[PDB]
Amino acid sequence: VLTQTTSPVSAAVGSTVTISCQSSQSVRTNKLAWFQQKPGQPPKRLIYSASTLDFGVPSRFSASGSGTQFTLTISDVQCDDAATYYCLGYFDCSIADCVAFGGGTEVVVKRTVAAPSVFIFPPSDEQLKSGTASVVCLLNNFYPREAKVQWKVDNALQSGNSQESVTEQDSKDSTYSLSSTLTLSKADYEKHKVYACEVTHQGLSSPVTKSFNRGE
Amino acid sequence: MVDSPQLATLAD
Amino acid sequence: QSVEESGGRLVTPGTPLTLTCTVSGFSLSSNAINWVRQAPGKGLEWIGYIAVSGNTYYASWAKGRFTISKASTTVDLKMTSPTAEDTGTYFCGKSNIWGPGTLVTVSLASTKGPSVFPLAPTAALGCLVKDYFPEPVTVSWNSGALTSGVHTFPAVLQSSGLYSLSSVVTVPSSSLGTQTYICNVNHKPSNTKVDKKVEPKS
C-alpha cells in the first residue's frame, strides 16, 4: 500500500502544491516514479528515480524523498496541471508485489467565483413517442465544482432518480459544466404539469429555478 | 541480464 | 518510440480474452513491458510485467486471473476467467512509453446502438445519446466545424444497465434559425452512425 495526499488539492495559478506519497513498507533502493494522468489520456511520467525529471517535463515539477516518504512539488501552478498524480514504487518480490501505484491525488486549479447559467430541457416529442421521458438541466461554466441541483415535479422534491455528469476542468478558464437528467416513465410524466430545476451555488446570491409547464 | 520492470529508472 | 494496445471489446463473464501490445520503434530484446489498468473513475493498477529474459511477474491479486507472454513484436495479456470487475481501460508500456489504452467491457448485456434525441434551444442546444451499450460513443457538431462552447459530458450508467450521455453547445440566439446545427453521433461497437438536426420547436 502506497498512501497519498487526499484529493482534491486545490491551488491558484502561480501558487505551489505539494503531494505526499507514504509507503507502509520501505521502497526498494530509491526506485520511485511520479506519473500524471488527465481523463481519457494515458499516464505520462514526470519523475523517475525519486528526484530526476523526465525529458520535456516543465521545471515547475520537483520531487524528493527516501525510505517511506516521498513528495512531489508543483511550483508556479498552471491551468495545465489540472490532473491526477500517481506515485509508483518498487519492492522486493517475495516480500510483496514488485510494483505498486499509490491511490492518486487530484489537483484542482483555484479560480475566481463564477456563477453557472442554467438551462432546462423538456423531453423531445420524438422520445415521448417512444415509451420514455428525460428532462435535462444544464449548469454551464461555473466555479467551484460544488453545486446543488434539485428537481421538482409539481413541487414534489425528486430524490435518488436523477443522474449527474460533470466535465473536467476547462483548459482556458478553469470552469466546470454539469448536466443532470431526470428520468420518468411516460405515464408518470403525463401525470404532472410543473417540471423545475433548482440550482444553489456560491456565485448565486439566491437559488435559480428554471422550469416549464408540460405543453406550453 | 537482471529483471526490471523499467518504470522508476530511465529505461529509454 | 511508441506502443499500441488492441483487442479490447465486450465479452461475457468467463470468456478468456487476450489483449495485445504492439511495440514500434524499439526492441523487446532490450526492453521490458508492463500491463496497467484502470476501472472507470478509479485509479491506476499495476497488473504485471515481462522482463527482457521472458520472466513474468504479477501483482498478488492478479495471479491466476492474468497471464503475460511475448512474441517478437508483441506482448499478450491473457485474461483467464473475466468477471464484471475486469471492466476498464488497459494500458501497456514502460517508463515514458504508454499507449492510448484499449477498453475492455465484461458484462451479460447485449451490444445496443443508442437513440439520439434533440435538446432544442446566448442559447443552449444539444443531443441526448441514450440507451447504448457498451462504451464508447463519439460526438461532434457540424462535422467538426463547431468546436467552440461545446460540452460533451462523460457517460453515466443508468438503472437499466445501459449508458446515456448528453452533448451540448452554447450559441448566439441570433444564429437560430439562420444556422444549421447537427450533432454527429458514432457508436462503433454497433456500427451505428447518426446525424441529428437540432432546431427550435415552437
C-alpha grid cell for residue A71? 513528495
Q: Which amino acid is at A179?
A: S
- CA-based nearest residue in chain B for residue C57: B5
Distance, in Å, from the CA atom of C98 to the CA atom of C101, rounded to the nearest integer, reads 8
Task: Give the B window 1-12 contacts with A, CB below 8 Å.
Answer: 5, 7-10
Contact in structure between C196 and C185 (CB atoms under 8 Å): yes
Cβ–Cβ under 8 Å, residues C13 and C84: yes
**Would you list the DSSP string of A33-90?**
EEEEE-TTS--EEEEETTTEEPTT--TTEEEEEETTEEEEEE-S--GGG-EEEEEEEE
The rounded Cα A180 to chain-centroid distance in angstroms is: 15
What number does CATH give the domain C1-108? 2.60.40.10
Residue identified by cell 483487442 is C7
Residues before each break in chain C (C–N > 2.5 Å)? Answer: 121
Cβ–Cβ of C46/A44 closer than 8 Å? no
DSSP state of C54: S
Name chain B's partners: 3 or more CB pairs within 8 A. A, C
- Domain extent listing, chain C: 1-108, 109-202
Q: Choose among B3, B9, B11: nearest Cβ to C31.
A: B11
The CATH code for residues A112-214 is 2.60.40.10
The letter for the amino acid at C181 is Y
**Among residues A194, A189, A127, which one has the least CA distance to residue C118?**
A127
Would you kindly state where each structural domain of chain A is located, as residue ranges? 1-111, 112-214
CB A133 within 8 A of CB A127: yes
Q: What are the chain B neighbours of C57 within 8 Å (beta carbons)?
A: 3, 5
Chain-chain contact of A89 with B9 (C-beta, under 8 angstroms): no
Closest CA to A28 of A44, A46, A50: A50
Q: What superfamily in CATH does domain C109-202 come from?
A: Immunoglobulins (2.60.40.10)
> Technique behind this structure?
X-ray
| PDB resolution in Å | 2.5
Residue to test with chain A: of B2, B4, B6, B7, most A Cβ within 10 A:
B7
Query: C49 CB near a chain B CB, below 8 Å?
Result: yes
Confirm if A18 and A72 have CB atoms less than 8 A apart: yes
Nearest Cβ partner for B5 among C32, C53, C96? C32
How far apart are alpha carbons C15 and C24 in whole angstroms?
29
Q: CA dist A179 to A94, A162, A165, A202, C165, Å?
A: 48, 10, 5, 18, 9
- Binary contact (C158, A130; C-beta < 8 A): no
Q: Measure the CA–CA gap between C172 and C62, rounded to whole angstroms.
A: 53
What 8-state DSSP symbol labels residue A114?
A: B
Look at the block and give the residue holding cell 513528495: A71
* Cis peptide, bond prior to residue A8, ω within 30 of zero: yes
Q: Tell me the count of A-C CB pairs closer than 8 A.
A: 109
Grid coordinates given for A74: 508543483
Query: Across-strand partners of A2?
Result: A23
Q: Say which of B5, B9, B10 has its CB closest to residue A98.
A: B5
Question: For A97, phi and psi rounded to 5 degrees?
Answer: -60, 140
Q: Which chains would you list as touching C if contact means 3+ CB atom pairs under 8 Å?
A: A, B
| Element housing A190 (H / E) | helix A186-191
Task: Tell me the CATH architecture of domain A1-111.
Answer: Sandwich (2.60)
Helix (H/G/I), strand (E/B), else coil: B3: coil
- Please count the residues of chain C: 202
- Residue A137 φ/ψ region, left for φ over 0, alpha for ψ in the -120 to 50 degree band, beta for the rest: beta
